[PDB]
Design a protein around this ligand. Structure first.
Ligand SMILES: CCCCCCCCCCCCCCCCCC(=O)OC[C@H](COP(=O)(O)OCCN)OC(=O)CCCCCCCCCCCCCCCCC
Ligand SMILES: CCCCCCCCCCCCCCCCCC(=O)OC[C@H](COP(=O)(O)OCCN)OC(=O)CCCCCCCCCCCCCCCCC
Ligand SMILES: CCCCCCCCCCCCCCCCCC(=O)OC[C@H](COP(=O)(O)OCCN)OC(=O)CCCCCCCCCCCCCCCCC
Ligand SMILES: CCCCCCCCCCCCCCCCCC(=O)OC[C@H](COP(=O)(O)OCCN)OC(=O)CCCCCCCCCCCCCCCCC
Ligand SMILES: CCCCCCCCCCCCCCCCCC(=O)OC[C@H](COP(=O)(O)O)OC(=O)CCCCCCCCCCCCCCCCC
Ligand SMILES: CCCCCCCCCCCCCCCCCC(=O)OC[C@H](COP(=O)(O)O)OC(=O)CCCCCCCCCCCCCCCCC
Ligand SMILES: [Ca+2]
Lengths: 121, 479, 50, 101
């Protein structure tokens, strides 16, 4: 397909080019700068005193519920992009069907808000 | 969408509208202070929608380019589902309040599950089948896990979700193969392409994947292992729901799929359904003997009974579908009666579920034990109970189709299964030393036991046209 | 001896096998579902395309 | 030359991989949720592959709805996992085992 070749192959080419530029910048210091590691240098930073522990412990995420609702809301908005692109050609059902779809969304959003699910645990 | 399309799906819009309005009413006007009121309005809504579906004059048709089928078969299934759902909610209302389990969202989640079931049985397209199934499945996972302080509720939801998602993935993979072969998702297009001379391994693989995905929902062996754990872990009201309404909807969906999409290859899928039915009947019967928890016993009872219902479908005939429909109707009535009693069981004010608690119950409450006796013999399939006539109908369909070997196996497994129903009768009437189980029942829960128990005997005299209604419904599907 | 041997010896032995297989482990239940599909696919393959 | 069979083969591999992840995992239920997402991704590959090679948009329409259910499934799957973690203190697969028989 021509559209693939003219428009999408440049994306693939530039993905490699931007990757090469980022990699060369990392390797620049890896090759030029002096490397002199010692146990104190490579230890974890906690403001001058040794860390109590590493960062591989459980940690309560007080916004966990909002993150679950983030997944749901992501899919709701996805249905709007083809609708917005097709807006000129929409039929009466196609137009008001979205309004019903968005009204059901707003009932869910009003339920979250009223329940208190948007306040952190 | 035309105005004729909208009229066809009006009962579904009414249920969906109620669920949305109920959500806002509960959120803005008291939350759990309305929980009891929302439960009873939902019961009325289920009955109102069932009246719209089942009463008046109906002319079969299709809506939305054939994606939604409004025929006698779908109307029979919807009515049983809605009435069974209404029964479970009504009989559980008092129990959930006493146990501090009645959130104002529980009635609404059940209503959206039933809405999904209504789209399942009227599916005329692979996408309609999927969206209806997934709306039901997602709602079922939630209520399985809704006892937050119970580790067993959490595990029931986890096992159901993971295995339900696996079965859904298999269903989708087969649905994708069927679409690739036929070039369409509509069943009228699919059925015309799937015929004797053109069945590649690919399209036969699609049928197997779809069948296995659906056979999970009726707890067919070996896609059953979720059922005992989920039945045990989930709240008893939620277990009673799983046992009645989803199974009816799922059984009708399988019949819809194999006749409206695979109706010209009956020979291919009839053998698979028969093999599922055989494994389910024997495992459910044999595994039930080893149960001491009544909720877990009902799961194996459920698996064995779905095996018998699949015998009617394995026949691949209008009579087989007619008798499968009657079987599911009678099975739902029996489970409503049984789970009404199970909910009432308690010692020292806490619910109890072990079978040993029934010892000598007949000498504690004579009328309740007598009702339980009729239900156990009805589940065992012993005359004169209406449960016997359910088995008689599917066995009739099997023999009528040249599958007497299946009927012989079916009755043999019935004998093994009869043992653990007989044992419950043994415990109640001449069992061992009693530990003081009492049955706490309000008026509604009490009628949820007696009326199904009476129906098992009154139904032996007259089915009140239900058998004739099932025959007309089966004809619209099979043709 | 035969009747009791079957009714009280064999069927309970099959019951104990069924109880054992219901292990409670989620990964075992998924394995059973996969064995079911694989077995059914073998069955369909032997019948062939037709 | 890349035809339909090439994409179906990729779909089959991802599908079997995702199924495999469910019944071999022992230590983490989140990785099972990832395997379910792999399994559904494999399905969409089939639907998109059949759609474009037939010249039909239904398979692409089907894919959008599979994503919708995948999102809803993940939300509910994580919510059920949250309540289990609170009740058990672990999310190891081998610990979802109290009910058996
Ligand atoms: C029939 C309507 C239900 C009326 C039930 C009467 C019970 C009285 C009661 O206490 O509850 C009514 C309840 C509103 O609760 P209320 O008690 O007024 O609140 C006090 C303020 N804290 O009201 C409710 O719970 C209302 C529940 C919502 C009903 C939805 C009605 C629309 C049906 C869907 C149509 C869709 C068509 C498209
Ligand atoms: C207010 C009204 C309440 C709702 C009643 C709906 C009535 C539906 C009905 O009668 O449907 C008829 C339908 C067959 O229709 P058709 O074949 O057209 O009949 C010829 C008509 N010229 O018939 C059918 O589809 C048959 C439906 C049979 C229903 C059996 C019950 C299902 C399981 C629920 C058991 C409930 C147990 C009781 C619980 C007590 C309280 C908890
Ligand atoms: C299978 C068969 C199943 C059917 C079995 C039926 C059994 C008989 C039921 C008896 C009557 C209802 C139960 C009465 C009751 O307990 O009341 C519930 C509720 C009380 O509220 P309250 O006391 O405030 O409770 C909170 C504090 N505990 O208040 C109520 O009573 C709630 C309101 C009653 C129910 C609704 C009645 C109005 C009709 C609504 C139709 C549905 C609307 C949606 C459809 C629209 C149609 C276009
Ligand atoms: C003490 C001795 C006990 C020995 C077992 C007793 C025999 C049990 C046989 C049951 C009756 C089955 C029968 O008559 O055959 C069913 C069927 C005939 O019906 P068909 O010709 O298909 O008519 C279709 C209608 N349109 O099909 C046939 O033509 C025959 C099919 C036979 C099915 C297997 C029978 C095995 C016998 C039971 C073994 C032990 C258990
Ligand atoms: C979402 C779930 C909640 C649904 C609750 C609201 C239902 C829809 C809104 C209420 C008014 C709809 C009346 C339809 C009128 C009609 O048939 O004529 C169309 C009419 C033209 O038809 P004509 O009269 O035949 O020319 O088109 C319009 O101008 C209005 C189009 C509205 C499209 C809305 C689509 C959503 C409804 C389907 C709901 C899905 C089932 C849920 C389960
Ligand atoms: C019917 C009556 C027959 C009932 C028994 C059926 C099982 C036959 C054996 C198949 C499984 C072999 C591996 C497990 C043996 C059990 C054991 O001793 O190990 C304990 C062992 C538990 O060990 P742990 O979990 O490591 O503690 O069991 C297992 O490992 C379970 C095996 C899971 C994977 C295979 C699942 C097979 C599903 C079978 C479903 C029913 C289909 C066949 C019946 C249809 C009806 C006719
Ligand atoms: Ca048909």
């Amino acid at each position: 397909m021509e559209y693939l070749l003219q428009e999408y192959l440049p994306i693939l080419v530039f993905l490699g080019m931007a990757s090469a530029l980022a990699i060369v910048l990392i390797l620049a210091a890896a090759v030029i700068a002096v490397r002199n590691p010692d146990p104190e240098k490579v230890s974890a930073y906690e403001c001058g005193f040794n860390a109590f522990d590493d960062a591989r412990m459980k940690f309560d995420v007080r916004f966990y519920l909002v993150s679950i609702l983030f997944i749901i809301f992501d899919l709701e908005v996805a249905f709007l992009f083809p609708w917005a692109v097709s807006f000129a050609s929409l039929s009466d059902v196609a137009f008001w069907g979205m309004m019903v779809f968005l009204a059901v969304l707003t009932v869910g959003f009003a339920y979250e808000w009223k329940k208190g699910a948007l306040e952190w645990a | 969408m035309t105005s004729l399309d909208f009229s066809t799906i009006l009962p579904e819009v009414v249920l969906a509208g109620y669920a949305l309005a109920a959500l806002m009413a509960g959120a803005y006007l008291g939350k759990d202070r309305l929980a009891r009121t929302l439960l009873w309005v939902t019961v009325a809504a289920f009955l109102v929608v069932a009246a719209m579906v089942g009463l008046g004059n109906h002319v079969d048709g299709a809506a939305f380019h054939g994606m939604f089928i409004d025929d006698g078969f779908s109307r029979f299934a919807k009515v049983v589902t809605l009435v069974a759902a209404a029964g479970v909610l009504a009989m559980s209302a008092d129990y959930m309040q006493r146990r501090n389990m009645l959130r104002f969202e529980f009635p609404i989640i059940v209503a959206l599950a039933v809405l999904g079931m209504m789209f399942m049985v009227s599916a005329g397209d692979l996408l309609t089948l999927y969206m209806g199934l997934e709306l039901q499945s997602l709602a079922l996972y939630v209520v399985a896990a809704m006892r937050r302080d119970s580790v067993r509720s959490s595990e029931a939801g986890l096992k159901y979700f993971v295995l339900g998602s696996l079965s859904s993935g298999l269903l989708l993979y087969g649905a994708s193969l069927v679409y690739g072969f036929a070039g369409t998702t509509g069943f009228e297009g699919i059925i015309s392409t799937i015929e004797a001379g053109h069945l590649s391994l690919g399209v036969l693989f699609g049928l197997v994947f779809m069948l296995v995905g659906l056979s999970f929902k009726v707890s067919a062996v070996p896609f059953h292992m979720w059922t005992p754990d989920v039945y045990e872990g989930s709240p008893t009201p939620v277990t009673a729901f799983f046992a009645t309404a989803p199974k009816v909807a799922a059984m009708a969906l399988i019949a819809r799929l194999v006749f409206d999409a695979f109706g010209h290859v009956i020979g291919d899928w009839s053998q698979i359904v028969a093999a599922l039915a055989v494994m389910s009947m024997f495992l459910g019967s044999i595994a039930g003997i080893g149960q001491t928890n009544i909720k877990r016993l009902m799961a194996y009872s459920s698996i064995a009974h779905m095996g018998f219902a699949l015998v009617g479908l394995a026949a691949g005939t209008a009579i087989g579908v007619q008798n499968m429909l009657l079987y599911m109707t009678i099975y739902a009535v029996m489970n409503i009666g049984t789970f009404a009693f199970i909910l009432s069981m308690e010692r020292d004010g806490v619910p109890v579920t072990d079978l040993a608690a029934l010892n000598r119950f007949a000498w504690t409450d004579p009328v309740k034990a007598l009702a339980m006796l009729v239900l156990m013999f009805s589940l065992a399939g012993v005359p004169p109970t209406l449960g016997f006539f359910a088995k008689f109908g599917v066995l009739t369909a099997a023999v009528d189709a040249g599958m007497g070997w299946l009927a012989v196996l079916g009755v043999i497994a019935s004998v093994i299964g009869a043992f653990y129903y007989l044992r419950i009768v043994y415990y109640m009437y001449f069992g061992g030393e009693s530990e003081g189980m009492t049955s706490r029942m309000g008026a509604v829960q009490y009628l949820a036991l007696m009326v199904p128990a009476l129906a098992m005997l009154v139904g032996a005299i007259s089915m009140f046209g239900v058998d004739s209604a099932a025959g007309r419904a089966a004809e619209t599907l099979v043709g | 001896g035969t009747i009791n041997g079957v009714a009280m010896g064999l069927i309970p032995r099959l019951t104990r096998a069924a109880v054992r297989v219901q292990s409670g482990y989620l990964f075992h239940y998924a394995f059973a579902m996969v064995l079911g599909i694989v077995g059914l696919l073998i069955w369909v393959m032997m019948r062939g395309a037709h | 030359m890349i035809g339909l069979t090439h994409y179906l083969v990729v779909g089959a591999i991802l599908f079997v991989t995702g199924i495999f992840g469910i019944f071999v995992n022992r230590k983490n239920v989140i990785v099972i949720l990832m395997s379910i997402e792999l399994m559904l991704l494999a399905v969409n590959i089939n639907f998109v592959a059949f759609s474009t090679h037939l010249g039909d948009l239904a398979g692409q329409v089907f894919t959008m709805f599979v994503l919708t259910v995948a999102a809803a499934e993940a939300a509910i799957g994580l919510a059920i996992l949250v309540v289990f973690f609170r009740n058990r203190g672990t999310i190891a697969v081998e610990d979802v085992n109290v009910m058996k028989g």
